[PDB]
Write an enzyme that holds these catalytic residues in place. Structure first.
Site, PDB file in Angstrom:
ATOM      1  N   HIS A  13     -27.322   3.097 -13.247  1.00  0.00           N
ATOM      2  CA  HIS A  13     -26.280   4.049 -13.617  1.00  0.00           C
ATOM      3  C   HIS A  13     -26.245   4.236 -15.146  1.00  0.00           C
ATOM      4  CE1 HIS A  13     -24.864   2.767  -9.473  1.00  0.00           C
ATOM      5  NE2 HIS A  13     -25.102   4.086  -9.390  1.00  0.00           N
ATOM      6  N   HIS A  17     -18.632   2.756 -24.261  1.00  0.00           N
ATOM      7  CA  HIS A  17     -17.511   2.036 -23.680  1.00  0.00           C
ATOM      8  C   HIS A  17     -17.721   0.538 -23.921  1.00  0.00           C
ATOM      9  CE1 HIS A  17     -16.627   5.449 -20.659  1.00  0.00           C
ATOM     10  NE2 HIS A  17     -16.246   5.715 -21.910  1.00  0.00           N
ATOM     11  N   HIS A  37     -21.626  -0.233 -22.643  1.00  0.00           N
ATOM     12  CA  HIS A  37     -22.612   0.697 -22.150  1.00  0.00           C
ATOM     13  C   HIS A  37     -22.259   2.071 -22.640  1.00  0.00           C
ATOM     14  CE1 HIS A  37     -19.391   1.255 -19.222  1.00  0.00           C
ATOM     15  NE2 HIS A  37     -19.850   2.477 -19.141  1.00  0.00           N
ATOM     16  N   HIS A  67     -22.543   6.561 -21.825  1.00  0.00           N
ATOM     17  CA  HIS A  67     -22.712   7.721 -21.017  1.00  0.00           C
ATOM     18  C   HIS A  67     -23.306   8.790 -21.911  1.00  0.00           C
ATOM     19  CE1 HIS A  67     -20.267   5.914 -17.839  1.00  0.00           C
ATOM     20  NE2 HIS A  67     -19.718   5.317 -18.859  1.00  0.00           N
ATOM     21  N   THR A 101     -14.467   4.620 -14.822  1.00  0.00           N
ATOM     22  CA  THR A 101     -15.030   5.962 -14.683  1.00  0.00           C
ATOM     23  C   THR A 101     -16.208   6.027 -13.740  1.00  0.00           C
ATOM     24  OG1 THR A 101     -16.547   5.854 -16.552  1.00  0.00           O
ATOM     25  CG2 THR A 101     -14.289   6.682 -16.996  1.00  0.00           C
ATOM     26  N   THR A 102     -16.544   4.853 -13.128  1.00  0.00           N
ATOM     27  CA  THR A 102     -17.537   4.755 -12.060  1.00  0.00           C
ATOM     28  C   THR A 102     -16.874   4.075 -10.883  1.00  0.00           C
ATOM     29  OG1 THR A 102     -18.320   2.737 -13.149  1.00  0.00           O
ATOM     30  CG2 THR A 102     -19.618   4.690 -13.444  1.00  0.00           C
ATOM     31  N   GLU A 149     -17.570  11.445 -21.574  1.00  0.00           N
ATOM     32  CA  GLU A 149     -16.677  11.449 -20.408  1.00  0.00           C
ATOM     33  C   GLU A 149     -15.320  12.005 -20.861  1.00  0.00           C
ATOM     34  OE1 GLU A 149     -17.210   7.525 -18.428  1.00  0.00           O
ATOM     35  OE2 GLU A 149     -18.450   8.788 -17.121  1.00  0.00           O
TER      36      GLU A 149
END
Length: 257
Positions: free
Chosen positions: A61, A116, A91, A93, A195-196, A103
């Site tokens: 992911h 994040h 991590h 995005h 958010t996942t 995000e």
């Protein structure tokens, strides 16, 4: 299983994770004119001098830089937070193009990427217990824009060739996350969610106003990662962001005027 494709992406997640339609989902658009300054907030305290990074993992992911969270070594306190939150991983995005990837959005603006830094509340003893609580996590979100390189990011970019595909990990010791922070700790804060999947509503979000700059070449390396495992058809790990969700009955507060 869930992902970021057409058949498995964010509009599908509610079928397996009905809280996706919940009351405090993340990310959100930060409408800067409607956020309200809250003079009672504190400065945040980011205490990362003793941080112990261990490993970097391509989880299919994103990639996670993991920390030793068995003692108060890298902790977040202050701001909107009551108590002490320990850094477990960070991590990113990011997008397929520089005009998308974040995000959170700011007045509908999308950044190239978002970092994040995920922390859990020590009163709950471990991460897995913390995510079951409304105040279990604190996530420090930092926007990335493309421009000048971020020197402190290079060692991360350096190692990505070694974790190209899902399930690969590499030792990643002695990485200092201080080198990923902007100059200012001015922030917005609101109650939200992971958010996942599993999208749990356990996060106090703290989103910094000042982006960091990274270079084209640095972002381009992110975009060479793969969602797939080794020996599977290649599918570039890009556009691993969930779009903004309804704010519902929430107020975003600002730490600054």
């Amino acid at each position: 299983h869930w992902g970021y494709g057409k058949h498995n992406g964010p509009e599908h997640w509610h079928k397996d994770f009905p809280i996706a339609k919940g009351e405090r989902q993340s990310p959100v658009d930060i409408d800067t004119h409607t956020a309200k300054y809250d003079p009672s907030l504190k400065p945040l305290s980011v205490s990362y001098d003793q941080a112990t990074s261990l490993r970097i993992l391509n989880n299919g992911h994103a990639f996670n830089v993991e920390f030793d969270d068995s003692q108060d070594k890298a902790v977040l306190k202050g701001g909107p937070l009551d108590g002490t939150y320990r850094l477990i991983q960070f991590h990113f995005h990011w997008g397929s193009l520089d005009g998308q990837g974040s995000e959170h959005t700011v007045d509908k603006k999308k950044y190239a990427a978002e970092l994040h830094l995920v922390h859990w509340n020590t009163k709950y003893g471990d991460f897995g217990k913390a995510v079951q609580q409304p105040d279990g996590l604190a996530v420090l979100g930092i926007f990335l824009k493309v421009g000048s390189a971020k020197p402190g990011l290079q060692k991360v970019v350096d190692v990505l060739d070694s974790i190209k595909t899902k399930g690969k990990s590499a030792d990643f010791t002695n990485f200092d996350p201080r080198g990923l922070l902007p100059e200012s700790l001015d922030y917005w804060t609101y109650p939200g969610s992971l958010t996942t999947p599993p999208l749990l509503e356990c996060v106090t979000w703290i989103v910094l106003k000042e982006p960091i700059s990274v270079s084209s070449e640095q972002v381009l390396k992110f975009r060479k990662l793969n969602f797939n495992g080794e020996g599977e058809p290649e599918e570039l790990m890009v556009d691993n962001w969930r779009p903004a969700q309804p704010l519902k009955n929430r107020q975003i507060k600002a730490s600054f005027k």
